[PDB]
mmCIF file of C-alpha atoms in Angstrom:
data_model
loop_
_atom_site.group_PDB
_atom_site.id
_atom_site.type_symbol
_atom_site.label_atom_id
_atom_site.label_comp_id
_atom_site.label_asym_id
_atom_site.label_seq_id
_atom_site.Cartn_x
_atom_site.Cartn_y
_atom_site.Cartn_z
ATOM 1 C CA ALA A 1 147.574 101.098 76.871
ATOM 2 C CA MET A 2 150.982 99.523 77.497
ATOM 3 C CA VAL A 3 153.689 100.949 75.224
ATOM 4 C CA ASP A 4 156.657 98.603 74.800
ATOM 5 C CA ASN A 5 159.916 99.652 73.170
ATOM 6 C CA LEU A 6 160.872 97.839 69.975
ATOM 7 C CA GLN A 7 164.332 97.245 68.539
ATOM 8 C CA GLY A 8 165.469 96.215 65.088
ATOM 9 C CA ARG A 9 164.604 92.738 59.065
ATOM 10 C CA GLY A 10 162.621 91.868 62.194
ATOM 11 C CA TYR A 11 161.315 93.909 65.116
ATOM 12 C CA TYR A 12 161.714 92.434 68.591
ATOM 13 C CA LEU A 13 160.925 93.487 72.145
ATOM 14 C CA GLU A 14 162.643 92.653 75.424
ATOM 15 C CA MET A 15 160.499 90.240 77.442
ATOM 16 C CA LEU A 16 160.916 89.075 81.037
ATOM 17 C CA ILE A 17 159.847 85.445 81.441
ATOM 18 C CA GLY A 18 159.771 83.230 84.504
ATOM 19 C CA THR A 19 160.557 83.553 88.209
ATOM 20 C CA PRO A 20 163.279 84.961 88.593
ATOM 21 C CA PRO A 21 162.679 86.815 85.322
ATOM 22 C CA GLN A 22 164.941 85.791 82.445
ATOM 23 C CA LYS A 23 165.387 88.418 79.701
ATOM 24 C CA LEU A 24 164.923 87.268 76.104
ATOM 25 C CA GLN A 25 164.530 89.018 72.751
ATOM 26 C CA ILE A 26 161.224 88.154 71.081
ATOM 27 C CA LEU A 27 160.233 88.752 67.468
ATOM 28 C CA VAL A 28 156.848 90.416 67.005
ATOM 29 C CA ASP A 29 154.942 88.321 64.451
ATOM 30 C CA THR A 30 151.394 89.195 63.398
ATOM 31 C CA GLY A 31 151.463 86.297 60.914
ATOM 32 C CA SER A 32 151.469 83.496 63.506
ATOM 33 C CA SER A 33 149.833 82.783 66.848
ATOM 34 C CA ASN A 34 152.289 80.864 69.066
ATOM 35 C CA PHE A 35 154.511 82.205 71.836
ATOM 36 C CA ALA A 36 157.736 80.211 71.477
ATOM 37 C CA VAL A 37 161.252 80.741 72.823
ATOM 38 C CA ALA A 38 164.576 78.947 72.532
ATOM 39 C CA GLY A 39 164.877 76.393 75.326
ATOM 40 C CA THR A 40 168.336 75.022 74.555
ATOM 41 C CA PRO A 41 171.634 76.635 73.546
ATOM 42 C CA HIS A 42 171.949 77.371 69.838
ATOM 43 C CA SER A 43 174.921 78.491 67.772
ATOM 44 C CA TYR A 44 173.164 81.555 66.370
ATOM 45 C CA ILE A 45 171.579 82.908 69.580
ATOM 46 C CA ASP A 46 173.246 84.376 72.659
ATOM 47 C CA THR A 47 170.667 83.317 75.270
ATOM 48 C CA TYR A 48 167.676 81.032 75.771
ATOM 49 C CA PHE A 49 164.909 80.313 78.275
ATOM 50 C CA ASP A 50 165.771 77.706 80.873
ATOM 51 C CA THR A 51 162.728 76.135 82.434
ATOM 52 C CA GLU A 52 164.779 74.662 85.258
ATOM 53 C CA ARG A 53 165.579 78.167 86.464
ATOM 54 C CA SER A 54 161.961 79.239 86.773
ATOM 55 C CA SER A 55 160.007 78.373 89.791
ATOM 56 C CA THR A 56 156.709 79.243 88.155
ATOM 57 C CA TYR A 57 157.087 77.235 84.962
ATOM 58 C CA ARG A 58 154.684 74.314 84.629
ATOM 59 C CA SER A 59 154.970 71.709 81.891
ATOM 60 C CA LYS A 60 151.771 70.556 80.195
ATOM 61 C CA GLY A 61 153.306 67.276 79.052
ATOM 62 C CA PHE A 62 153.280 67.476 75.269
ATOM 63 C CA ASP A 63 155.156 68.880 72.289
ATOM 64 C CA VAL A 64 154.114 70.887 69.250
ATOM 65 C CA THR A 65 155.663 71.468 65.828
ATOM 66 C CA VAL A 66 154.994 74.813 64.139
ATOM 67 C CA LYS A 67 155.973 75.420 60.527
ATOM 68 C CA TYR A 68 156.343 78.750 58.734
ATOM 69 C CA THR A 69 156.906 79.938 55.178
ATOM 70 C CA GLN A 70 160.626 79.493 55.905
ATOM 71 C CA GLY A 71 161.758 77.602 58.990
ATOM 72 C CA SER A 72 160.164 75.406 61.635
ATOM 73 C CA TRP A 73 160.585 74.334 65.244
ATOM 74 C CA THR A 74 159.483 71.798 67.843
ATOM 75 C CA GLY A 75 159.053 72.707 71.494
ATOM 76 C CA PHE A 76 157.644 71.589 74.811
ATOM 77 C CA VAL A 77 154.377 73.301 75.730
ATOM 78 C CA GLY A 78 153.892 74.697 79.226
ATOM 79 C CA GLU A 79 152.964 77.909 81.002
ATOM 80 C CA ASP A 80 154.905 80.597 82.840
ATOM 81 C CA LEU A 81 154.593 84.231 83.877
ATOM 82 C CA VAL A 82 155.641 87.108 81.620
ATOM 83 C CA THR A 83 156.494 90.203 83.658
ATOM 84 C CA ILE A 84 154.902 93.399 82.323
ATOM 85 C CA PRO A 85 154.448 95.530 85.465
ATOM 86 C CA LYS A 86 151.374 97.770 85.661
ATOM 87 C CA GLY A 87 149.307 98.600 88.745
ATOM 88 C CA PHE A 88 148.888 95.721 91.185
ATOM 89 C CA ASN A 89 149.802 93.265 88.395
ATOM 90 C CA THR A 90 153.370 91.996 88.139
ATOM 91 C CA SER A 91 153.002 89.418 85.354
ATOM 92 C CA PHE A 92 150.545 87.407 83.267
ATOM 93 C CA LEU A 93 150.178 83.639 82.930
ATOM 94 C CA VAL A 94 150.615 82.650 79.284
ATOM 95 C CA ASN A 95 151.125 79.533 77.214
ATOM 96 C CA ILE A 96 154.727 79.151 76.063
ATOM 97 C CA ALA A 97 156.486 76.698 73.753
ATOM 98 C CA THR A 98 160.124 76.089 74.732
ATOM 99 C CA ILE A 99 162.010 75.100 71.588
ATOM 100 C CA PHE A 100 164.379 72.129 71.780
ATOM 101 C CA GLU A 101 164.505 71.203 68.058
ATOM 102 C CA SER A 102 164.427 73.501 65.039
ATOM 103 C CA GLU A 103 165.541 73.853 61.425
ATOM 104 C CA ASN A 104 166.453 77.104 59.649
ATOM 105 C CA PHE A 105 164.522 79.003 62.332
ATOM 106 C CA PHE A 106 167.449 80.471 64.287
ATOM 107 C CA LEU A 107 169.583 81.969 61.523
ATOM 108 C CA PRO A 108 173.063 83.540 61.649
ATOM 109 C CA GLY A 109 172.663 87.275 62.151
ATOM 110 C CA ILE A 110 169.272 87.340 63.864
ATOM 111 C CA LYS A 111 169.054 89.286 67.124
ATOM 112 C CA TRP A 112 166.009 87.530 68.613
ATOM 113 C CA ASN A 113 165.684 84.156 70.336
ATOM 114 C CA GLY A 114 161.892 83.774 70.445
ATOM 115 C CA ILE A 115 158.759 84.649 68.513
ATOM 116 C CA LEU A 116 155.532 86.310 69.677
ATOM 117 C CA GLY A 117 152.571 85.313 67.525
ATOM 118 C CA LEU A 118 149.979 88.083 67.636
ATOM 119 C CA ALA A 119 147.507 86.661 65.105
ATOM 120 C CA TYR A 120 144.179 84.992 65.871
ATOM 121 C CA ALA A 121 143.573 81.735 67.721
ATOM 122 C CA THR A 122 142.704 80.020 64.431
ATOM 123 C CA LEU A 123 146.416 79.815 63.591
ATOM 124 C CA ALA A 124 147.547 78.449 66.968
ATOM 125 C CA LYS A 125 149.096 74.975 67.183
ATOM 126 C CA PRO A 126 148.236 72.300 68.082
ATOM 127 C CA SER A 127 144.692 73.702 68.033
ATOM 128 C CA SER A 128 142.741 76.948 68.182
ATOM 129 C CA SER A 129 141.988 76.192 71.845
ATOM 130 C CA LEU A 130 145.595 76.966 72.889
ATOM 131 C CA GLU A 131 145.060 80.474 74.241
ATOM 132 C CA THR A 132 147.030 83.160 72.427
ATOM 133 C CA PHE A 133 149.458 85.452 74.229
ATOM 134 C CA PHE A 134 147.379 88.556 73.532
ATOM 135 C CA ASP A 135 144.120 86.856 74.526
ATOM 136 C CA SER A 136 145.778 85.896 77.811
ATOM 137 C CA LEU A 137 146.739 89.557 78.217
ATOM 138 C CA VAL A 138 143.255 90.819 77.353
ATOM 139 C CA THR A 139 141.447 88.455 79.717
ATOM 140 C CA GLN A 140 143.808 88.849 82.684
ATOM 141 C CA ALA A 141 144.408 92.616 82.451
ATOM 142 C CA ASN A 142 140.993 93.402 80.894
ATOM 143 C CA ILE A 143 142.610 95.817 78.440
ATOM 144 C CA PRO A 144 140.956 96.616 75.079
ATOM 145 C CA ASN A 145 141.313 93.866 72.478
ATOM 146 C CA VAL A 146 143.538 96.132 70.371
ATOM 147 C CA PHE A 147 147.241 96.627 69.722
ATOM 148 C CA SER A 148 149.217 98.844 67.370
ATOM 149 C CA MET A 149 152.735 98.892 65.973
ATOM 150 C CA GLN A 150 155.061 101.754 65.056
ATOM 151 C CA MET A 151 158.082 100.524 63.077
ATOM 152 C CA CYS A 152 160.780 103.116 62.434
ATOM 153 C CA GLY A 153 163.473 101.148 60.596
ATOM 154 C CA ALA A 154 162.757 102.644 57.171
ATOM 155 C CA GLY A 155 166.136 103.330 55.596
ATOM 156 C CA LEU A 156 168.123 101.189 58.027
ATOM 157 C CA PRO A 157 170.282 98.842 55.968
ATOM 158 C CA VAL A 158 169.966 95.117 56.563
ATOM 159 C CA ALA A 159 173.487 94.863 58.025
ATOM 160 C CA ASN A 160 165.609 101.811 68.173
ATOM 161 C CA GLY A 161 162.957 99.807 66.364
ATOM 162 C CA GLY A 162 159.824 101.687 67.303
ATOM 163 C CA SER A 163 156.912 100.874 69.579
ATOM 164 C CA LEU A 164 154.410 98.099 70.271
ATOM 165 C CA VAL A 165 151.291 99.486 71.961
ATOM 166 C CA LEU A 166 149.303 96.812 73.794
ATOM 167 C CA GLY A 167 145.706 97.665 74.614
ATOM 168 C CA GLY A 168 145.107 100.585 72.275
ATOM 169 C CA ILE A 169 146.638 103.470 70.350
ATOM 170 C CA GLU A 170 149.157 106.211 71.127
ATOM 171 C CA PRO A 171 148.329 109.478 69.306
ATOM 172 C CA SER A 172 151.959 110.611 69.579
ATOM 173 C CA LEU A 173 153.035 107.826 67.213
ATOM 174 C CA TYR A 174 151.150 109.006 64.111
ATOM 175 C CA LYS A 175 149.966 112.147 62.346
ATOM 176 C CA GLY A 176 146.930 112.891 60.234
ATOM 177 C CA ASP A 177 143.900 110.645 59.996
ATOM 178 C CA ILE A 178 143.577 106.919 60.604
ATOM 179 C CA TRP A 179 141.971 104.913 57.796
ATOM 180 C CA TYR A 180 140.390 101.596 58.773
ATOM 181 C CA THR A 181 139.865 98.595 56.507
ATOM 182 C CA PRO A 182 137.704 95.602 57.496
ATOM 183 C CA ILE A 183 139.168 92.252 58.512
ATOM 184 C CA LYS A 184 137.694 89.747 56.060
ATOM 185 C CA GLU A 185 138.749 86.646 58.016
ATOM 186 C CA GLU A 186 140.150 86.199 61.529
ATOM 187 C CA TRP A 187 143.134 83.875 61.143
ATOM 188 C CA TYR A 188 145.867 85.986 59.669
ATOM 189 C CA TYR A 189 145.065 89.706 59.545
ATOM 190 C CA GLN A 190 143.370 89.278 56.186
ATOM 191 C CA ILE A 191 142.189 92.451 54.451
ATOM 192 C CA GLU A 192 140.578 93.117 51.068
ATOM 193 C CA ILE A 193 142.784 94.689 48.399
ATOM 194 C CA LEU A 194 140.854 96.265 45.532
ATOM 195 C CA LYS A 195 143.501 97.861 43.302
ATOM 196 C CA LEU A 196 147.257 98.378 42.826
ATOM 197 C CA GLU A 197 148.746 101.423 41.102
ATOM 198 C CA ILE A 198 152.313 102.064 39.936
ATOM 199 C CA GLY A 199 153.458 105.518 38.875
ATOM 200 C CA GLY A 200 149.844 106.669 38.799
ATOM 201 C CA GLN A 201 148.712 103.918 36.416
ATOM 202 C CA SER A 202 146.484 101.104 37.641
ATOM 203 C CA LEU A 203 147.200 97.436 37.149
ATOM 204 C CA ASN A 204 144.263 96.141 35.102
ATOM 205 C CA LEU A 205 144.146 92.773 36.871
ATOM 206 C CA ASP A 206 140.938 91.363 38.297
ATOM 207 C CA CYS A 207 140.736 92.535 41.896
ATOM 208 C CA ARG A 208 140.410 88.877 42.946
ATOM 209 C CA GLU A 209 144.042 88.262 41.948
ATOM 210 C CA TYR A 210 145.219 90.513 44.788
ATOM 211 C CA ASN A 211 143.162 88.336 47.114
ATOM 212 C CA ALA A 212 143.778 84.943 45.609
ATOM 213 C CA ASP A 213 143.932 82.915 48.696
ATOM 214 C CA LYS A 214 144.725 85.873 50.937
ATOM 215 C CA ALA A 215 146.053 89.388 51.413
ATOM 216 C CA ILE A 216 147.434 89.787 54.921
ATOM 217 C CA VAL A 217 149.306 92.171 57.214
ATOM 218 C CA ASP A 218 152.255 90.258 58.695
ATOM 219 C CA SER A 219 155.006 92.029 60.634
ATOM 220 C CA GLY A 220 156.922 88.735 60.691
ATOM 221 C CA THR A 221 157.510 88.883 56.934
ATOM 222 C CA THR A 222 160.281 91.205 55.774
ATOM 223 C CA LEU A 223 159.442 92.002 52.160
ATOM 224 C CA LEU A 224 156.255 92.712 50.237
ATOM 225 C CA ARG A 225 155.229 89.325 48.829
ATOM 226 C CA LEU A 226 152.899 89.137 45.831
ATOM 227 C CA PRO A 227 151.241 86.227 43.998
ATOM 228 C CA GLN A 228 153.259 85.342 40.918
ATOM 229 C CA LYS A 229 150.922 86.967 38.390
ATOM 230 C CA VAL A 230 150.660 90.104 40.529
ATOM 231 C CA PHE A 231 154.448 90.118 40.937
ATOM 232 C CA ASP A 232 155.034 89.838 37.186
ATOM 233 C CA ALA A 233 152.530 92.646 36.595
ATOM 234 C CA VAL A 234 154.180 94.849 39.227
ATOM 235 C CA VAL A 235 157.704 94.224 37.926
ATOM 236 C CA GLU A 236 156.644 95.114 34.379
ATOM 237 C CA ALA A 237 154.909 98.314 35.499
ATOM 238 C CA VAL A 238 157.829 99.332 37.727
ATOM 239 C CA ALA A 239 160.333 98.829 34.908
ATOM 240 C CA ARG A 240 158.249 100.899 32.483
ATOM 241 C CA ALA A 241 157.572 103.771 34.900
ATOM 242 C CA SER A 242 161.189 103.810 36.106
ATOM 243 C CA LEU A 243 163.727 106.276 34.756
ATOM 244 C CA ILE A 244 166.229 103.381 34.544
ATOM 245 C CA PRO A 245 166.504 102.096 30.949
ATOM 246 C CA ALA A 246 166.964 98.375 31.627
ATOM 247 C CA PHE A 247 166.867 95.893 34.497
ATOM 248 C CA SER A 248 168.647 92.593 35.011
ATOM 249 C CA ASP A 249 166.412 89.651 35.878
ATOM 250 C CA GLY A 250 168.463 89.083 39.027
ATOM 251 C CA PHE A 251 167.507 92.494 40.397
ATOM 252 C CA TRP A 252 163.811 91.593 40.395
ATOM 253 C CA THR A 253 164.525 88.100 41.733
ATOM 254 C CA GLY A 254 166.753 89.505 44.466
ATOM 255 C CA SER A 255 169.746 87.592 43.099
ATOM 256 C CA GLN A 256 171.584 90.873 42.460
ATOM 257 C CA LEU A 257 171.901 94.316 43.955
ATOM 258 C CA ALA A 258 172.392 97.732 42.486
ATOM 259 C CA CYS A 259 175.280 99.692 43.930
ATOM 260 C CA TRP A 260 175.615 103.487 43.882
ATOM 261 C CA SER A 261 175.700 109.770 48.113
ATOM 262 C CA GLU A 262 173.026 109.653 45.411
ATOM 263 C CA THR A 263 169.940 107.470 45.944
ATOM 264 C CA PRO A 264 168.183 105.468 43.201
ATOM 265 C CA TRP A 265 164.902 106.376 44.915
ATOM 266 C CA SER A 266 164.130 109.263 42.546
ATOM 267 C CA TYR A 267 164.390 106.892 39.554
ATOM 268 C CA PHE A 268 161.534 104.611 40.665
ATOM 269 C CA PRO A 269 157.757 105.139 40.789
ATOM 270 C CA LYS A 270 155.427 105.066 43.757
ATOM 271 C CA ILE A 271 153.308 101.999 44.513
ATOM 272 C CA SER A 272 149.806 102.338 45.950
ATOM 273 C CA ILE A 273 147.521 99.694 47.450
ATOM 274 C CA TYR A 274 143.813 100.534 47.526
ATOM 275 C CA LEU A 275 141.895 99.122 50.493
ATOM 276 C CA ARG A 276 138.150 99.040 51.055
ATOM 277 C CA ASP A 277 136.923 101.358 53.800
ATOM 278 C CA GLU A 278 134.572 100.340 56.595
ATOM 279 C CA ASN A 279 132.073 102.246 54.454
ATOM 280 C CA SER A 280 131.840 99.660 51.678
ATOM 281 C CA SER A 281 131.128 102.402 49.127
ATOM 282 C CA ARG A 282 134.635 103.817 49.569
ATOM 283 C CA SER A 283 138.311 102.953 49.497
ATOM 284 C CA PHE A 284 141.525 104.554 50.677
ATOM 285 C CA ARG A 285 145.060 103.969 49.447
ATOM 286 C CA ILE A 286 148.354 103.394 51.219
ATOM 287 C CA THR A 287 151.324 104.428 49.088
ATOM 288 C CA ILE A 288 154.928 103.301 49.486
ATOM 289 C CA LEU A 289 157.744 105.327 47.969
ATOM 290 C CA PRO A 290 160.936 103.817 46.517
ATOM 291 C CA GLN A 291 162.596 104.484 49.885
ATOM 292 C CA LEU A 292 160.722 101.416 51.170
ATOM 293 C CA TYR A 293 160.984 98.839 48.350
ATOM 294 C CA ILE A 294 164.450 99.828 47.053
ATOM 295 C CA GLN A 295 166.361 98.804 50.097
ATOM 296 C CA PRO A 296 169.874 99.588 51.317
ATOM 297 C CA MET A 297 171.847 96.576 52.397
ATOM 298 C CA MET A 298 175.084 97.825 53.875
ATOM 299 C CA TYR A 299 178.500 103.739 48.766
ATOM 300 C CA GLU A 300 175.444 101.595 49.168
ATOM 301 C CA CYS A 301 173.878 98.659 47.431
ATOM 302 C CA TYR A 302 170.160 98.236 47.058
ATOM 303 C CA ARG A 303 167.794 95.330 46.670
ATOM 304 C CA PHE A 304 164.312 95.000 45.209
ATOM 305 C CA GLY A 305 162.067 94.863 48.270
ATOM 306 C CA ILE A 306 159.310 92.836 46.604
ATOM 307 C CA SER A 307 159.298 89.073 46.110
ATOM 308 C CA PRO A 308 156.994 86.550 44.418
ATOM 309 C CA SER A 309 154.727 84.270 46.424
ATOM 310 C CA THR A 310 152.602 81.301 45.395
ATOM 311 C CA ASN A 311 149.742 81.551 47.896
ATOM 312 C CA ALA A 312 149.395 84.932 49.546
ATOM 313 C CA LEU A 313 149.800 88.683 49.192
ATOM 314 C CA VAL A 314 151.776 89.467 52.345
ATOM 315 C CA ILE A 315 151.931 93.104 53.443
ATOM 316 C CA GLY A 316 155.277 92.670 55.188
ATOM 317 C CA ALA A 317 157.545 94.895 57.228
ATOM 318 C CA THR A 318 158.809 96.895 54.240
ATOM 319 C CA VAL A 319 155.282 98.292 53.827
ATOM 320 C CA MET A 320 154.425 98.536 57.528
ATOM 321 C CA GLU A 321 157.624 100.572 57.944
ATOM 322 C CA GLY A 322 155.806 103.474 56.282
ATOM 323 C CA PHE A 323 152.778 103.607 58.563
ATOM 324 C CA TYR A 324 151.419 103.305 62.077
ATOM 325 C CA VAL A 325 149.377 100.092 61.884
ATOM 326 C CA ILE A 326 146.478 99.377 64.244
ATOM 327 C CA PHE A 327 145.264 95.813 64.809
ATOM 328 C CA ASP A 328 141.764 96.578 66.090
ATOM 329 C CA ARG A 329 140.482 93.078 66.793
ATOM 330 C CA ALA A 330 137.555 94.284 68.916
ATOM 331 C CA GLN A 331 136.055 96.042 65.867
ATOM 332 C CA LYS A 332 137.392 93.592 63.238
ATOM 333 C CA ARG A 333 139.416 96.180 61.336
ATOM 334 C CA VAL A 334 142.998 97.158 60.552
ATOM 335 C CA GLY A 335 143.930 100.841 60.750
ATOM 336 C CA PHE A 336 146.680 102.678 58.879
ATOM 337 C CA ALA A 337 148.056 106.162 59.509
ATOM 338 C CA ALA A 338 151.030 108.282 58.506
ATOM 339 C CA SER A 339 154.089 107.774 60.709
ATOM 340 C CA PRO A 340 156.533 110.640 61.392
ATOM 341 C CA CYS A 341 158.999 108.035 62.655
ATOM 342 C CA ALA A 342 159.132 106.480 59.162
ATOM 343 C CA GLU A 343 160.720 109.489 57.430
ATOM 344 C CA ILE A 344 164.304 109.292 56.178
ATOM 345 C CA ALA A 345 166.287 112.531 56.496
ATOM 346 C CA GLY A 346 163.076 114.499 56.936
ATOM 347 C CA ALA A 347 161.590 113.117 53.703
ATOM 348 C CA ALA A 348 158.448 110.998 53.720
ATOM 349 C CA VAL A 349 158.610 107.347 52.674
ATOM 350 C CA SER A 350 154.867 106.817 52.253
ATOM 351 C CA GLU A 351 151.529 108.513 51.711
ATOM 352 C CA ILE A 352 147.934 107.764 52.673
ATOM 353 C CA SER A 353 144.838 109.345 51.158
ATOM 354 C CA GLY A 354 141.130 108.925 50.576
ATOM 355 C CA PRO A 355 138.282 108.484 50.228
ATOM 356 C CA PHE A 356 137.734 106.986 46.769
ATOM 357 C CA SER A 357 134.456 105.612 45.526
ATOM 358 C CA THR A 358 134.251 101.888 44.894
ATOM 359 C CA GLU A 359 131.416 102.140 42.394
ATOM 360 C CA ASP A 360 133.749 100.748 39.661
ATOM 361 C CA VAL A 361 134.951 97.627 41.528
ATOM 362 C CA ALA A 362 133.173 94.428 42.648
ATOM 363 C CA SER A 363 131.428 94.270 45.967
ATOM 364 C CA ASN A 364 133.832 91.566 47.186
ATOM 365 C CA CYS A 365 137.325 91.095 45.765
ATOM 366 C CA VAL A 366 138.080 88.043 47.944
ATOM 367 C CA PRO A 367 137.284 84.889 45.874
#
């Protein structure tokens, strides 16, 4: 149960790579499955991984190109040792992609210089057979096939991250009960959403619209991303339930920000996502308060923390910042629990409750 400090849009951990160890800042990404680090100087990073300096690095004589929602890179594939001391084990041998070409991947302002893909082998490039970082860890250290994340940046404006627990769960990082939802497909961390509620009133959309293509838990995505129809439905319900008379289109699109001591949080409704329980006859709900989706950017200006997607419903960081999230791969489930670290000024930013019967919803909401 290795507990690694996190720092923080994106949460990154300090990683020692190579022999002698080189220290790099690596983004934790549960929406991809490649370990990749900068391998050449770049304008927007302060350090990179130099293969020449590591005695243990071994090239595997080929390149790979990975593409994301936004941004992409190309890197040489090899293997080196990542130093995570524990017991008689100094480091672990992992696959690593050393980036030499990239576009809109390293951006001005980012604090990381690598990415740690913690999703399933299915998403790994060039193929599923390129062993994941976490699978390397599990097989070499024989730790449980489980990891959990505590993100504590709720309220931090965009201009101490939390904790990444490798091999299990840390009771100190959450309070109350853990609610587990099944993993429908092992590529992303795809879960089944059954219902969305805003200000206590349910969206009357078919539950398959929340799962059209996929609903996933991705720490590498900042905002809550919703399929267009879901997004339009959410925006309409938020505007109605809000105490604010009118909204500019730019606010919803993120083109504009609202500037205000006093918070706009008490003028917006709560948003709840119902998730099927391991007991298929029940559901639980995770609820985000305005503190999470009305986000401070700097007198403060706030942005709408929800954005439209075409393909997927991405449970991004702005939702995960309200809970302790457990990626239980060994039991094919994702766990959620209340997080004391998520509070702002002693006030909660999220709720979690259950159980709720699923008698009134279809047996499978994933089309």
